[PDB]
Amino acid sequence: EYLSKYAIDMTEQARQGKLDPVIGREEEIRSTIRVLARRIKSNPCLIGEPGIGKTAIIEGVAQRIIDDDVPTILQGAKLFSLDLAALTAGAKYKGDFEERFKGVLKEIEESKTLIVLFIDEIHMLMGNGKDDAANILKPALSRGQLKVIGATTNNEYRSIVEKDGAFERRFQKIEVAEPSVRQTVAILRGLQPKYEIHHGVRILDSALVTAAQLAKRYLPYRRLPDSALDLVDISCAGVAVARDSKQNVVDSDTISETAARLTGIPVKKLSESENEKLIHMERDLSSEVVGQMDAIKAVSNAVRLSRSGLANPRQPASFLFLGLSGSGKTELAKKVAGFLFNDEDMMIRVDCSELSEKYAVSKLLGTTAGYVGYDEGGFLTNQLQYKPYSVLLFDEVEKAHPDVLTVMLQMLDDGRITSGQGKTIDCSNCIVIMTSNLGAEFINSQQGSKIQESTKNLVMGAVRQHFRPEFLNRISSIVIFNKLSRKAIHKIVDIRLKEIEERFEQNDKHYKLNLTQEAKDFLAKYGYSDDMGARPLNRLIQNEILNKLALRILKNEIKDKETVNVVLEECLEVLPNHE
Amino acid sequence: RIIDDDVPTILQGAKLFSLDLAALTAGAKYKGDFEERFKGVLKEIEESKTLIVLFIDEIHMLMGNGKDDAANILKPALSRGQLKVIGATTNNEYRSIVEKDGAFERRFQKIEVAEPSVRQTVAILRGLQPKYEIHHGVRILDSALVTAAQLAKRYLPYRRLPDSALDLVDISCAGVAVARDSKQNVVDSDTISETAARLTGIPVKKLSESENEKLIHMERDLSSEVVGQMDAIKAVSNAVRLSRSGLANPRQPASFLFLGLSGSGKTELAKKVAGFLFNDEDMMIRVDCSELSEKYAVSKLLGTTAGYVGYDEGGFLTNQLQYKPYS
Ligand SMILES: Nc1ncnc2c1ncn2[C@@H]1O[C@H](COP(=O)(O)OP(=O)(O)OP(O)(O)=S)[C@@H](O)[C@H]1O
Ligand SMILES: Nc1ncnc2c1ncn2[C@@H]1O[C@H](COP(=O)(O)OP(=O)(O)OP(O)(O)=S)[C@@H](O)[C@H]1O
Ligand SMILES: Nc1ncnc2c1ncn2[C@@H]1O[C@H](COP(=O)(O)OP(=O)(O)OP(O)(O)=S)[C@@H](O)[C@H]1O
């Protein structure tokens, strides 16, 4: 009985129970059975992607077999899971494993009721150059009963039959696929007592639902049975630790924290501190963003939609930041990331001046099949696979070549971002920002520092001249970055010096910062041009103030309360010591 | 446990015998003598004088070399009559037993036997401590036993603890007696740490008397020959310094990546390091990374599995590291 030395008697296990319940797979089972009930080519296959119930089906049919819920032909049949050592026990001496394979088929073929094999991984037999290379040992007898149910993913399947050509003329593919979200829940429910027993915890029914929905909207690279079950099992393990520490899987908190840990995506965590969350961010940003509350609100609005689920699952929120050059809109994208992730450097960004029709799409998403370089994902999906929710930033997107600009439509809506190798990324809870200086021409009208009605349409005009309407009409919001003028820049300067103090290495020296009109004007006069915007306010602060005082610090001429003043372009700040 | 009566009386009344080998090889000429040799054993085993349990320490040496009905058939054939047999086999051998016979899997109860932890190992060593002290006429420090088990776990990965720890104890005890009785006790450090190093290599466990003539001179001499790159020399010397006494992480090789202008000594330093470490530059294991393809790149270093043209695995790494632990 060679079979008993290599295979697992699934029937015996089923006879003894020790199997999971099988949920919703009745039709895959019916099809499997129907093929097995055939006169000749009774060789069905369970085919799809990993983690979709392919072996569940077998436990299922094993149970149907035990209970005679099968056709006459199968009523008394038995089933064995083989593979494994059948191909490797014969580690030495030519023809040894071949003899086993044959002996097994002989054992199966003769007399002993109807025996059905289950091949878990038919691709492992493959037919490695045929010429007696394992899989090739079968075909001679595929008509001679020796019924067998196979299993393989579509990639594996396609590889086998393309290279072989006979198996696809001998076997009956049965599509096996992930369940709907509700069906997934039913599955999770069926396995619920298994996990509850092994971990000693309860699972809320709503946790099963959350895991099913979450998996569908969280893990694009894992099929629902495994994906949702892992969310359940991983969560159960976490709960078991809590149980042991001194419980159940909490739909909201166990699963959300587990998910937050596993991947991130702020939306899946959603903090309960509503009094401040999604409120305070505008104030935090206001300090960074002086005057331009309009941009803050535009962003904050999208952030608020993603939280609590108002945002559309397939529409990553996205903005186009138009405006006065030097407006500070890039830092805004980082400061938003600051709030969103408690990480200003979470983002992925692309320098769009590097883009050309000759290569840009591949620089962004990676090259395709047969071409040099497999840096799949290029600048972008290469990184999305690690941080699906990171903020995306397109520096000077206005300079991006129009073809790659068009590819970026995927970020804006119908979020099926793909990779050059024919793979799918899928973005949802991912805020995307693109930048342009087109609004500068209208902001520079100076008709109030705030861009006004009508003039903002002139901006849209400039935008239509550079961006296709196909892009523009799909942006969550197009935001215009206004003139800061003297009032904002006086505040920006006071603020920049403050914010620098807080981050100026250590608070050992401290500042007075009494700029007085002299230094406020220096920074606001020889700095903030409308076309340089705030860029020079920071540069003068660093080039003249932080630098000269730093040099005095290095000489140990400064001990306490540093001040700022000017010579009176010769002003150049030029600050005294503070020893 | 039987003579001490820690065994159910059902079994306690039994006698235990170590069999095989001569049991078969005593005969030769005369076909069937082999069966005649197993046959009266397999009768006397139950003939009034209690039940005798046979011990086949190496079950895997039964079954038959090409089967040949080499009296192995007597076992299954008679196995219904108790005739209890206890045996043993290596994990690897068990696989062979099962595949070769089948019936043995059905007749025997497989039992996994665990490797002890260092803590458990030391307890074992303590039990045997007096045997070695008596056998050699030397004493053993308790910390020495701890050291042997702990040290072995870290520096004898090819040998399981029940043996590795004892090898260090027995070898060390002999080292003490041997030196003594040439033309005392086993010291955790001065005897075992040093003994293991003499056996396995690992200079850091020699607990050398001088980090001047091992580290200091290293920086000087590497600097004497390699001019400039002082930064690198110190980086290596310091990384090496951390391995002293085993302070460095038990799972991480000293490791460097040398970047820089060609002609700056990126490999010359490495040779000089070997020049210091083994007192010989040629003891460095050069890995020809210049020739790599993902389809050969690993295999030439680590070799391949059975069934592939040529086994002689390990071209550059396995074949050297198995013999040179601190290369
Ligand atoms: N009704 C079910 N019965 C048993 N297992 C289930 C069931 N539903 C989901 N599963 C999970 O799926 C696993 C086995 O089912 P599959 O999705 O076929 O996994 P698989 O991909 O067949 O396994 P391989 O060997 O990688 S194909 C189990 O270990 C469970 O975690
Ligand atoms: N309205 C604003 N929004 C954001 N940051 C601002 C604003 N006004 C001033 N800043 C400050 O200006 C600096 C950020 O400037 P950057 O974003 O590098 O310049 P930029 O205008 O983004 O350059 P671009 O976007 O390529 S034209 C920070 O120090 C901000 O605190
Ligand atoms: N700092 C140095 N002091 C003394 N001799 C040196 C020094 N650097 C290099 N040399 C000599 O020049 C060669 C340096 O050899 P290598 O270290 O291989 O050069 P390299 O940079 O390794 O070459 P590659 O291609 O990067 S391996 C040796 O043959 C030494 O004789």
PDB file of N, CA, C and O in Angstrom, chain A residues 4-6 85 88-92 100, chain B residues 95 98-103 105 306-307:
ATOM      1  N   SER A   4      -0.276   4.639   1.310  1.00  0.00           N
ATOM      2  CA  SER A   4      -0.338   4.945   2.726  1.00  0.00           C
ATOM      3  C   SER A   4       0.985   5.450   3.278  1.00  0.00           C
ATOM      4  O   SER A   4       1.035   5.926   4.406  1.00  0.00           O
ATOM      5  N   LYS A   5       2.068   5.320   2.513  1.00  0.00           N
ATOM      6  CA  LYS A   5       3.365   5.786   2.970  1.00  0.00           C
ATOM      7  C   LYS A   5       3.600   7.220   2.533  1.00  0.00           C
ATOM      8  O   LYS A   5       4.579   7.837   2.953  1.00  0.00           O
ATOM      9  N   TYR A   6       2.743   7.738   1.651  1.00  0.00           N
ATOM     10  CA  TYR A   6       2.978   9.062   1.107  1.00  0.00           C
ATOM     11  C   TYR A   6       1.809  10.015   1.297  1.00  0.00           C
ATOM     12  O   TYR A   6       2.012  11.213   1.470  1.00  0.00           O
ATOM     13  N   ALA A  85       6.723  13.600  -0.593  1.00  0.00           N
ATOM     14  CA  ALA A  85       7.789  12.629  -0.719  1.00  0.00           C
ATOM     15  C   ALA A  85       7.613  11.721  -1.902  1.00  0.00           C
ATOM     16  O   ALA A  85       8.571  11.091  -2.339  1.00  0.00           O
ATOM     17  N   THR A  88      10.336  12.749  -3.933  1.00  0.00           N
ATOM     18  CA  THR A  88      11.652  13.033  -3.353  1.00  0.00           C
ATOM     19  C   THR A  88      12.207  11.918  -2.496  1.00  0.00           C
ATOM     20  O   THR A  88      13.385  11.925  -2.147  1.00  0.00           O
ATOM     21  N   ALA A  89      11.377  10.954  -2.127  1.00  0.00           N
ATOM     22  CA  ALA A  89      11.855   9.840  -1.314  1.00  0.00           C
ATOM     23  C   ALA A  89      12.989   9.148  -2.063  1.00  0.00           C
ATOM     24  O   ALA A  89      14.018   8.780  -1.495  1.00  0.00           O
ATOM     25  N   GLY A  90      12.847   9.067  -3.381  1.00  0.00           N
ATOM     26  CA  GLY A  90      13.844   8.451  -4.251  1.00  0.00           C
ATOM     27  C   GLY A  90      14.972   9.419  -4.565  1.00  0.00           C
ATOM     28  O   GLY A  90      15.223   9.772  -5.715  1.00  0.00           O
ATOM     29  N   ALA A  91      15.656   9.845  -3.505  1.00  0.00           N
ATOM     30  CA  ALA A  91      16.741  10.821  -3.557  1.00  0.00           C
ATOM     31  C   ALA A  91      17.984  10.234  -4.207  1.00  0.00           C
ATOM     32  O   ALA A  91      18.917  10.963  -4.540  1.00  0.00           O
ATOM     33  N   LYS A  92      18.009   8.914  -4.355  1.00  0.00           N
ATOM     34  CA  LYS A  92      19.111   8.224  -4.987  1.00  0.00           C
ATOM     35  C   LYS A  92      18.571   7.078  -5.796  1.00  0.00           C
ATOM     36  O   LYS A  92      17.568   6.477  -5.421  1.00  0.00           O
ATOM     37  N   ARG A 100       7.715   4.572  -7.385  1.00  0.00           N
ATOM     38  CA  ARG A 100       6.713   4.842  -6.379  1.00  0.00           C
ATOM     39  C   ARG A 100       5.474   5.389  -6.999  1.00  0.00           C
ATOM     40  O   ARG A 100       4.368   4.970  -6.677  1.00  0.00           O
TER      41      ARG A 100
ATOM     42  N   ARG B  95      13.431   8.302   8.635  1.00  0.00           N
ATOM     43  CA  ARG B  95      12.867   8.430   7.312  1.00  0.00           C
ATOM     44  C   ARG B  95      13.231   7.210   6.470  1.00  0.00           C
ATOM     45  O   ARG B  95      12.350   6.564   5.898  1.00  0.00           O
ATOM     46  N   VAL B  98      11.289   3.968   7.565  1.00  0.00           N
ATOM     47  CA  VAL B  98       9.921   3.971   7.173  1.00  0.00           C
ATOM     48  C   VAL B  98       9.774   3.667   5.718  1.00  0.00           C
ATOM     49  O   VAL B  98       9.041   2.755   5.338  1.00  0.00           O
ATOM     50  N   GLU B  99      10.518   4.378   4.893  1.00  0.00           N
ATOM     51  CA  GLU B  99      10.384   4.190   3.472  1.00  0.00           C
ATOM     52  C   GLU B  99      10.811   2.796   3.027  1.00  0.00           C
ATOM     53  O   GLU B  99      10.137   2.179   2.186  1.00  0.00           O
ATOM     54  N   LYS B 100      11.888   2.270   3.627  1.00  0.00           N
ATOM     55  CA  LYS B 100      12.383   0.947   3.282  1.00  0.00           C
ATOM     56  C   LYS B 100      11.466  -0.201   3.681  1.00  0.00           C
ATOM     57  O   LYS B 100      11.323  -1.157   2.917  1.00  0.00           O
ATOM     58  N   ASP B 101      10.855  -0.136   4.865  1.00  0.00           N
ATOM     59  CA  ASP B 101      10.040  -1.257   5.324  1.00  0.00           C
ATOM     60  C   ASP B 101       8.531  -1.067   5.369  1.00  0.00           C
ATOM     61  O   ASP B 101       7.788  -2.031   5.175  1.00  0.00           O
ATOM     62  N   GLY B 102       8.044   0.102   5.772  1.00  0.00           N
ATOM     63  CA  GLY B 102       6.603   0.268   5.927  1.00  0.00           C
ATOM     64  C   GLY B 102       6.071  -0.346   7.229  1.00  0.00           C
ATOM     65  O   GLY B 102       5.590   0.363   8.117  1.00  0.00           O
ATOM     66  N   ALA B 103       6.190  -1.668   7.361  1.00  0.00           N
ATOM     67  CA  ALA B 103       5.689  -2.371   8.542  1.00  0.00           C
ATOM     68  C   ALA B 103       6.299  -1.807   9.807  1.00  0.00           C
ATOM     69  O   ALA B 103       5.587  -1.624  10.786  1.00  0.00           O
ATOM     70  N   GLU B 105       6.983   1.223  10.467  1.00  0.00           N
ATOM     71  CA  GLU B 105       6.274   2.426  10.883  1.00  0.00           C
ATOM     72  C   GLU B 105       5.014   2.005  11.616  1.00  0.00           C
ATOM     73  O   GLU B 105       4.599   2.610  12.600  1.00  0.00           O
ATOM     74  N   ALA B 306      20.598  17.264  -3.847  1.00  0.00           N
ATOM     75  CA  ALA B 306      20.763  15.977  -4.508  1.00  0.00           C
ATOM     76  C   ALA B 306      19.973  15.912  -5.809  1.00  0.00           C
ATOM     77  O   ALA B 306      18.896  16.496  -5.921  1.00  0.00           O
ATOM     78  N   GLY B 307      20.515  15.196  -6.789  1.00  0.00           N
ATOM     79  CA  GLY B 307      19.860  15.048  -8.075  1.00  0.00           C
ATOM     80  C   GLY B 307      20.425  15.967  -9.137  1.00  0.00           C
ATOM     81  O   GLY B 307      19.994  15.946 -10.288  1.00  0.00           O
TER      82      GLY B 307
END
